[PDB]
Amino acid sequence: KETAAAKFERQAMDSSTSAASSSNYCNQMMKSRNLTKDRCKPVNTFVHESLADVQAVCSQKNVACKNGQTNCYQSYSTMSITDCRETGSSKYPNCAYKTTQANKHIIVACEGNPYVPVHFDASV
Ligand SMILES: [Cl-]
Ligand SMILES: [Cl-]
Q1: Where in this chain does the entry annotate a coiled-coil region?
Q2: What is the chain written as a DSSP string?
Q3: Domain extents for the chain?
Q4: Do residues 124 and 104 touch, judged by C-beta distance below 8 A?
Q5: Minimum-distance ligand to the CA of 31?
Q6: In what order do the strands lie in the sheet with 79-86?
Q7: Superfamily of structural domain 1-124
Q8: How far is the CA of 61 from the centre of ligand 2 (A)?
């Protein structure tokens, strides 16, 4: 299996672009990251920052996770992100997504050693 850390990297990181400059970004990335393989993953967020900057969030503001756990951290600054969400008329395997580009603080759950992000809790 994929480790938790690697799975986060694959689903969330997109350091190759500064921001989504197309309405087709999500359709293309969701497919390329293999997120539409067995089904259409309904929601996903990609972060357009360096991996090092994202990992560093694990040393930032400690806050509660939506589930109540306390291993969540909120980034001190805003980051470039792209929210990908399935449209109402999307059907596997013809997955279709709405692309929404924004600048928001990210909140992630961190774990392990090294202590890195394992799940994307939300953005503010
Ligand atoms: Cl790993
Ligand atoms: Cl994969």
Answers
A1: none
A2: ---HHHHHHHHHB-TT-SS--STTHHHHHHHHTT-SSSS--SEEEEE-S-HHHHHGGGGSEEE--TTS-S-EEE-SS-EEEEEEEE-TT-BTTB--EEEEEEEE-EEEEEETTTTEEEEEEEE-
A3: 1-124
A4: yes
A5: 2
A6: 43-47, 79-86, 97-104
A7: Ribonuclease A-like domain (3.10.130.10)
A8: 31
